[PDB]
Amino acid sequence: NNKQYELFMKSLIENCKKRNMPLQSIPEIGNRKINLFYLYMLVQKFGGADQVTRTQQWSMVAQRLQISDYQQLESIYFRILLPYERHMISQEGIKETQAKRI
After folding, report:
1. Do residues 46 and 18 lie in contact, with contact meaning Cβ atoms separated by under 8 Å?
2. After which residues is the chain broken (C to N over 2.5 A)?
3. I need a surface site. Which of 15, 47, 64, 88 has the fewest CB within 10 A?
4. Are 87 and 37 in contact (CB under 8 A)?
């Protein structure tokens, strides 16, 4: 699962580059390569950053990547790949990501 990164990564990148580089550099929070989809996989509890970015569930994300900075979290969620994260949860078009099993 060492490639799993380059996979979801390419997705996020297309966003950072399409969102006008909302970072200008990966906010490498923790002590190594970012684990966006990781702490993000936890935000799922809410599904919508803007809702989780100011709640308790955030403590889960924020406190999972040893950052304890809920603000950096939505920086992750929103400032790196808001759309993507909030995309592959509700449906994402059920014709691109999940594509109804396919």
Report:
1. no
2. none
3. 47
4. no
